[PDB]
Write an enzyme that holds these catalytic residues in place. Structure first.
Site, PDB file in Angstrom:
ATOM      1  N   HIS A  52       0.815  -1.217   0.000  1.00 39.57           N
ATOM      2  CA  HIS A  52       0.000   0.000   0.000  1.00 39.57           C
ATOM      3  C   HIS A  52       0.849   1.269   0.000  1.00 39.57           C
ATOM      4  CE1 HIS A  52       0.399   0.185   4.511  1.00 39.57           C
ATOM      5  NE2 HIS A  52       0.279   1.480   4.275  1.00 39.57           N
ATOM      6  N   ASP A  94       0.826  -7.667   2.921  1.00 36.97           N
ATOM      7  CA  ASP A  94       1.060  -6.287   2.477  1.00 36.97           C
ATOM      8  C   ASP A  94       2.568  -6.037   2.356  1.00 36.97           C
ATOM      9  OD1 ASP A  94       0.721  -3.627   1.791  1.00 36.97           O
ATOM     10  OD2 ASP A  94      -0.289  -3.055   3.642  1.00 36.97           O
ATOM     11  N   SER A 170       4.491   2.816   7.846  1.00 43.09           N
ATOM     12  CA  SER A 170       4.239   1.707   6.927  1.00 43.09           C
ATOM     13  C   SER A 170       5.495   1.318   6.157  1.00 43.09           C
ATOM     14  CB  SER A 170       3.122   2.071   5.945  1.00 43.09           C
ATOM     15  OG  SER A 170       1.884   2.202   6.616  1.00 43.09           O
TER      16      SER A 170
END
Length: 217
Positions: A52, A94, A170
């Site tokens: 992402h 992810d 992230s």
């Protein structure tokens, strides 16, 4: 990425020292702003981060700037490297490899820092002390912060912990006490836990398959 009851975090100023050098700041401009994230250099031309995060580039890897060992918005001791190829993990986690171009001096990202050591994760367990280090967006832009905590859950390709992270974290590397990468932070459940892609045997195979020089210990 959630602030948890355990919020034990401190800034890294000597960002090229020790295992901090492979920790990388990611900047992706959008029309009207920017997305930022984190990553870790693991190969000659390769970092690890989230699907992402790289998605912020909308399919164009040259929108992604990677600044290994970024110290602050005016202090990039290793400059930057531009995205060249996005290699997503085929499974459901992810996780993505970002392959980057050499810099203006024809240096490769894995030459200007020591590539991180990947744990084989044979000893990784609940309640072990870990860190997640990267670029939280509640701090000044491109400043590196280490967050201290413990593993609370291991399952398939997921590793969870009780330490605090924030949007911007992230893709941050999850380090054990031997400074080896055991997982790649991607998110969490606010405010129960934060979570990483766990580098189990199947993820390790994906890495070696795409980064032959990878250092798995």
């Amino acid at each position: 990425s959630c602030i948890l009851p355990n919020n034990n975090r401190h800034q890294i100023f000597n960002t090229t020292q020790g295992h901090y050098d492979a920790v990388s700041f990611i900047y992706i401009p959008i029309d009207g702003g920017y997305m930022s994230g984190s990553g870790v250099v693991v190969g000659e031309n390769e970092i690890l981060t989230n699907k992402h995060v790289v998605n912020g580039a909308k399919g164009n890897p040259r929108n992604i700037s990677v600044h290994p060992s970024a110290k602050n918005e005016n202090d990039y001791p290793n400059g930057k490297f531009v995205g060249q190829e996005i290699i997503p993990y085929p499974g459901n986690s992810d996780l993505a490899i970002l392959r980057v171009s050499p810099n203006e001096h024809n240096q490769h990202i894995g030459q200007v820092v020591k590539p991180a050591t990947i744990s084989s994760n044979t000893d990784t367990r609940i309640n072990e002390n870990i860190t997640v280090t990267g670029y939280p967006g509640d701090k000044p832009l491109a400043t590196m912060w280490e967050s201290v905590g413990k593993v609370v859950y291991i399952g398939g390709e997921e590793l969870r912990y009780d330490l605090s992270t924030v949007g911007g974290n992230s893709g941050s590397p999850v380090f054990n006490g031997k400074n080896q990468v055991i997982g790649i932070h991607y998110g969490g459940v606010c405010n129960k836990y934060n979570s990483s892609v766990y580098i189990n045997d199947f993820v390790q195979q994906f890495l070696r398959n795409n980064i032959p020089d990878i250092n798995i210990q």
